[PDB]
């Protein structure tokens, strides 16, 4: 029961990061399935962590995607 209460808190953490402020990128291609490539709309390329509990089947083809702006 303790570990379940800390998960709800673990996710709560990351949801603060999920919500705005954000910047909008575009997914080019994966490089693993836990790392991906995006070109941000500042026209800069980042290799980035793929967050878990997300899409991976419309993500891998080219599609919009939300990235954090300070992380």
């Amino acid at each position: 029961r303790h570990l379940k209460r800390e998960l709800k808190r673990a996710q709560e953490e990351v949801k603060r990061i999920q919500s705005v402020p954000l910047v909008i990128g575009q997914f080019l291609e994966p490089i693993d399935q836990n790392t991906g490539i995006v070109s941000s709309t500042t026209g800069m390329s980042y290799v980035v962590r793929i967050l878990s509990t997300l899409d991976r089947e419309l993500l891998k083809p080219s599609m919009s995607v939300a990235l954090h702006r300070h992380s």
Partner: protein
Amino acid sequence: DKTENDIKALQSIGQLIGEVMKELSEEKYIVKASSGPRYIVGVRNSVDRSKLKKGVRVTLDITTLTIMRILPRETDPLVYNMTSFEQ
């Protein structure tokens, strides 16, 4: 009072203009900024959903990036020079 008004502007900060490019979700809006790059940004309860439509200019903060108010449209500095010809 002439200097009190300057204090009140000074301890405030500027706004950075966008426009609603596309609605995403209740509290999340996609804007395309007048400076360029698109963001996802939030809303206060200082604006309504029935008070926003697309191509309507919105304010953002430059320290949290959240909409507080509806902004009238913009129009070129250039086209104001043409209305000043009439001679």
